[PDB]
Design a protein around this ligand. Structure first.
Ligand code: 4X8
Length: 150
């Protein structure tokens, strides 16, 4: 009864979250996950500003309306060598990572660790935040409000 949430640096408040290091988050779970970080799914405009501050990943994740990958450097294995906010057009499947937006974060690059999941609710799950530098924070709780996600 354990969930790992791997989180990135924030860029203009936007960050990437993956669950157990594999694509495994539904659209409903993504919204709930961001809410647990006192965050929201980013708008396209928010994500484009994050990109302009240095944000890129090699992973599909939800934003409010689309599934995207922010890309600064062309890479043939990430978003078919595209740059900019690459939008996923055609897929059979529904589970990705997510992006989240925290308005209270610093305006540019914030590569400090995340040490809390402030808006998690009471629950039985051991939830571990895992930073890219390995730094961890664990707590017992839950964040999923839809039964189909559990
Ligand atoms: C690189 C990679 C992959 N090959 C498959 C799935 N996910 C990733 C990206 N992950 C890799 C693992 C990890 C651990 C802690 C924080 C962060 N941000 C990350 C980012």
């Amino acid at each position: 009864n354990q969930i790992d949430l791997n989180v990135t640096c924030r860029y203009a408040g936007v960050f990437h979250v993956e669950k157990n290091g594999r694509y495994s988050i539904s659209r409903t779970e993504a919204a709930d996950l961001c809410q647990a970080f006192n965050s929201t799914l980013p708008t396209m405009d928010q994500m484009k500003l994050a990109l302009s501050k240095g944000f890129e990943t090699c992973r599909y994740g939800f934003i409010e309306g689309n599934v995207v990958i922010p890309r600064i450097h062309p890479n043939a294995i990430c978003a078919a060598n595209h740059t900019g906010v690459y939008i996923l057009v055609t897929s059979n499947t529904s589970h990705y990572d997510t992006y989240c937006f925290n308005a209270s974060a610093p305006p540019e690059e914030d590569c400090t660790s995340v040490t809390d999941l402030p808006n998690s609710f009471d629950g039985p799950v051991t939830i571990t935040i895992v930073n890219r530098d390995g730094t961890r924070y664990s707590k017992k709780g839950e964040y999923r409000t839809h039964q189909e996600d559990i």
